[PDB]
Design an enzyme around this catalytic site. Structure first.
Site, PDB file in Angstrom:
ATOM      1  N   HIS A  41       0.811  -1.209   0.000  1.00 28.34           N
ATOM      2  CA  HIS A  41       0.000   0.000   0.000  1.00 28.34           C
ATOM      3  C   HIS A  41       0.843   1.257   0.000  1.00 28.34           C
ATOM      4  O   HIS A  41       0.354   2.343  -0.305  1.00 28.34           O
ATOM      5  CB  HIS A  41      -1.045  -0.020   1.126  1.00 28.34           C
ATOM      6  CG  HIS A  41      -0.513   0.331   2.454  1.00 28.34           C
ATOM      7  ND1 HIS A  41      -0.128  -0.576   3.405  1.00 28.34           N
ATOM      8  CD2 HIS A  41      -0.341   1.581   2.980  1.00 28.34           C
ATOM      9  CE1 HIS A  41       0.264   0.102   4.484  1.00 28.34           C
ATOM     10  NE2 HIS A  41       0.142   1.409   4.249  1.00 28.34           N
ATOM     11  N   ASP A  84       0.092  -7.672   1.678  1.00 26.19           N
ATOM     12  CA  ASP A  84       0.513  -6.276   1.605  1.00 26.19           C
ATOM     13  C   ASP A  84       2.027  -6.135   1.615  1.00 26.19           C
ATOM     14  O   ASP A  84       2.614  -5.510   2.509  1.00 26.19           O
ATOM     15  CB  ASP A  84      -0.125  -5.514   2.743  1.00 26.19           C
ATOM     16  CG  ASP A  84       0.042  -3.995   2.654  1.00 26.19           C
ATOM     17  OD1 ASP A  84       0.382  -3.487   1.570  1.00 26.19           O
ATOM     18  OD2 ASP A  84      -0.174  -3.303   3.704  1.00 26.19           O
ATOM     19  N   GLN A 177       0.594   5.642  11.564  1.00 21.21           N
ATOM     20  CA  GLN A 177       0.720   6.240  10.234  1.00 21.21           C
ATOM     21  C   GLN A 177       2.134   6.747  10.068  1.00 21.21           C
ATOM     22  O   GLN A 177       2.740   7.458  10.859  1.00 21.21           O
ATOM     23  CB  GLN A 177      -0.271   7.407  10.120  1.00 21.21           C
ATOM     24  CG  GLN A 177      -1.688   6.975   9.776  1.00 21.21           C
ATOM     25  CD  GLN A 177      -2.279   6.040  10.812  1.00 21.21           C
ATOM     26  OE1 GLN A 177      -2.580   6.449  11.933  1.00 21.21           O
ATOM     27  NE2 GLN A 177      -2.450   4.777  10.440  1.00 21.21           N
ATOM     28  N   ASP A 179       4.654   4.614   9.679  1.00 19.96           N
ATOM     29  CA  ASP A 179       5.466   3.433   9.955  1.00 19.96           C
ATOM     30  C   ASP A 179       5.228   2.331   8.923  1.00 19.96           C
ATOM     31  O   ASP A 179       5.977   1.348   8.919  1.00 19.96           O
ATOM     32  CB  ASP A 179       5.154   2.873  11.343  1.00 19.96           C
ATOM     33  CG  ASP A 179       5.638   3.754  12.464  1.00 19.96           C
ATOM     34  OD1 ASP A 179       6.756   4.312  12.354  1.00 19.96           O
ATOM     35  OD2 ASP A 179       4.912   3.874  13.493  1.00 19.96           O
ATOM     36  N   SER A 180       4.181   2.443   8.093  1.00 22.64           N
ATOM     37  CA  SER A 180       3.854   1.384   7.154  1.00 22.64           C
ATOM     38  C   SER A 180       5.077   0.991   6.344  1.00 22.64           C
ATOM     39  O   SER A 180       5.895   1.801   5.938  1.00 22.64           O
ATOM     40  CB  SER A 180       2.776   1.806   6.177  1.00 22.64           C
ATOM     41  OG  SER A 180       1.528   1.901   6.811  1.00 22.64           O
TER      42      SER A 180
END
Length: 224
Positions: A41, A84, A177, A179-180
């Site tokens: 993502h 993902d 948010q 850290d993805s």
């Protein structure tokens, strides 16, 4: 990272920060000199020219070695929260040495065991909803949450066999948010996942959800 502490130099030697359009965006893991693993993502559907990777620095803005991207490959079954992971190829190869190293991956067929200790790191917000993001890398240790408990939190179908969960039931420690795509490792320092999704950050009774390297290892090995 919510509820974390400052990373030390030489922690996570394989971690990279990933900027987009010159601003903070996500994390990743350096697999070899020309390859980064991140969350799908983070990269799917965006212009690849917007991205820059930085390795070998606690700072996401300065220091270390940078590269642009040559290509992006998402897992062939990626959709939304499921499967993902993405493989990024780097325009500039990054050698190991000093505070740069390469990740060691969980084995194909492995699954993190409930209650074991994991450590996640990144440059994401330090508050759910925060207005600024740290310059220097943070880390936090959280236990694995069983897939069964995570399914009780999120729904049976929502947590697949290519995801695992980690967090504390009362909250307060999590990825968040920005850290993805960055790394979560086990107690052997083996890369077992990438930060993926969750309901808010560090909420009681809503674990962080991670893409499982063990489950997606065939894809990684094909393209690494």
């Amino acid at each position: 990272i919510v509820g974390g502490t400052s990373a030390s130099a030489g922690d996570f030697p394989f971690i990279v920060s990933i900027s987009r359009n010159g601003g903070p965006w996500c994390g990743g893991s350096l697999l070899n000199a020309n390859t980064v693993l991140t969350a799908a993502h983070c990269v799917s559907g965006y212009a690849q020219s917007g991205f820059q990777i930085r390795a070998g620095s606690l700072s996401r803005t300065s220091g270390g070695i940078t590269s642009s991207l040559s290509s992006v490959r998402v897992h062939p079954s990626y959709s939304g929260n499921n499967n993902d992971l993405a493989i990024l190829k780097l325009s500039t190869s990054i050698p190991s040495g000093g505070n740069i190293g390469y990740a060691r991956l969980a084995a194909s067929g492995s699954d993190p065991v409930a209650g074991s200790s994991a450590t996640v790191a990144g440059w994401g917000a330090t508050s759910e909803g925060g207005s600024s993001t740290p310059v220097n890398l943070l880390k936090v240790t959280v236990p694995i949450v069983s897939r069964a408990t995570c399914r009780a939190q999120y729904g049976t179908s929502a947590i697949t066999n290519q995801m695992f969960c980690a967090g504390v039931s009362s909250g307060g420690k999590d990825s968040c948010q920005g850290d993805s795509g960055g790394p979560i490792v086990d107690s052997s320092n083996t890369l077992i996942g990438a930060v993926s999704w969750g309901n808010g950050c560090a909420r009681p009774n809503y674990s962080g959800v991670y893409a499982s390297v063990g489950a997606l290892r065939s894809f990684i090995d094909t393209y690494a």
